[PDB]
Amino acid sequence: AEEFPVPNGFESAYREVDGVKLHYVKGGQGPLVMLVHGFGQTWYEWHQLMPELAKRFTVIAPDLPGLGQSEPPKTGYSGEQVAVYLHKLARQFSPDRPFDLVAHDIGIWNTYPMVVKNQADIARLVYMQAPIPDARIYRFPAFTAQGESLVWHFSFFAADDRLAETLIAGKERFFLEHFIKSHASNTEVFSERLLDLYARSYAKPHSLNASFEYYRALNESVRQNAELAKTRLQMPTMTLAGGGHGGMGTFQLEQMKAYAEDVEGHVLPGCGHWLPEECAAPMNRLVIDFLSR
């Protein structure tokens, strides 16, 4: 059945995009807002924001190709390839108006190329909790004086020999719980049930592989973005980042300043990586107000 419970007033549905069957959850009325999840998660990370946003917007939350209930991409996992699927999906529902885009973690990687190449289609942009793939990612440290670093998983997941799938298979729940909590400030929000739901979804063999193929394409995404970034983003943009353990801190806004002419940023003290869940109410408020103004 459904991997995650659908909110009242929303529908779980599918659309073929370039031969790939994409799953999404959709509700509401008005101009379109697309919410794009990241690693370890699915559309469901947005399930608290979606009903509030649906009071003023049509809201669509897709599963990334190969994750949740979406088929793997038939082209590839680089940012430019994946962004085609998400752009065409959004245009099926908002052909005559620009739409809003909210993205978390690798949802940024998988949307930035279509934002920069189709700027007239993007009304307002919200990015949270991950670098746009560029040379700045090569400066993050492998190890810190307090223990494990924030992004050593870039190398673990990008390694060949199916290193990550092979070590994590049979231990998917254990690994995801450790990964979520090592990047969280507020772990209490991750109940047994919620961890069970996310672990069952990404443990599907094609989804476990899909998860890491996004990282195996990361250097290709960096190289793609080096050319794309010659064009700055002109639409109103907001960045959000956690200020606590697991948070990107000032990096999110400071990077975005190099990409966007019109950008405002917020750092949320006491919040880590998983902003829609760790800090749902303030994150929801900031997104709703930014998109409603």
Q: Which residues bind its own copies (CB under 8 A)?
A: 135, 137-152, 154-156, 158-161, 163, 166-168, 171, 174-175, 178, 182, 218-219, 222
Residue whose CB is less far from ligand 7F2, 44 or 99? 44
CA 53, distance to chain mean position in Å, is: 17
Alpha-carbon gap, residue 238 to 43, rounded angstroms: 20
Q: Are 241 and 185 in contact (CB under 8 A)?
A: no
Residue whose CB is less far from its own copies, 144 or 234? 144
- The item of ligand 7F2, its own copies, none sharing an interface with residue 155, based on CB under 5 to 8 Å by kind, is its own copies
Answer for which of 22, 34, 36, 130 binds ligand 7F2 (CB under 6 A) is 130
Q: Are 211 and 67 in contact (CB under 8 A)?
A: yes
Residue whose CB is less far from ligand 7F2, 27 or 133? 133
Please state the closest distance from residue 183 (CB atom) to ligand 7F2, in A. 5
Binding-site size, ligand 7F2 (CB under 6 A): 12
Q: Are 86 and 108 in contact (CB under 8 A)?
A: no
What is the SS3 assignment for 102?
strand
Q: Are 249 and 243 in contact (CB under 8 A)?
A: yes
Distances (CA, A) of 26 to 23, 34, 51, 54, 88: 10, 9, 10, 9, 16
Contact set for ligand 7F2, span 20-79 (CB under 6 A): 38-39
Footprint on this chain of ligand 7F2 (rule: CB under 6 A): 38-39, 105-106, 129-130, 150-151, 183, 246, 248, 273
